[PDB]
Amino acid sequence: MAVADLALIPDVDIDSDGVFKYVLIRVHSAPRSGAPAAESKEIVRGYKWAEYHADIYDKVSGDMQKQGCDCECLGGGRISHQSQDKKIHVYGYSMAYGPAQHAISTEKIKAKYPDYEVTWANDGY
Template structure:
């Protein structure tokens, strides 16, 4: 992977709470085929699109391309070391929570990370 793609953090979420998140596929604007899925979420975002708009602007400044793969919600309980991924985005649809969970598990290996398609 190119340095720009490697420089993008896999996960940037709030340290605790319940908040919206988006799953974003980042790729190089060339024929290399290099891609990376990232998770972004924070409570300050009123809409999933607010998260995507902010993240996509910073990623595109690196010369990379991004595409939202969907969204949902994250319940991050740092005290109990537990993360639950669930729900969907009205604008982007449901993210593949299995992919999101795998990314979160690599960032939080000592956490219990689970997902469900229930809830909004």
């Protein structure tokens, strides 16, 4: 057996084919209840099957807790690819958890290159 680590956790995984909802979840160091520290990091999730931010929070916290972690949605919002430019955008707020720090989402997604480039606004729905 080996312990996973916060760096090995998939950092971003999102759909890219229209308009769908997303969540930003913090993850604490507890893989297999044997991780060497109590550091934390955030992960970015959002998919067309999660018609509500609670669906991704529950699903993803299930996967993280199976690894061994403990987690919390900091907030959520909506993600929208817009026809006029390839770029995706991150905006709105979770009706259940309030606005995420969408600045994290843009930093994360731009680093991870799941599509091309992204932006945010602290507004919208």
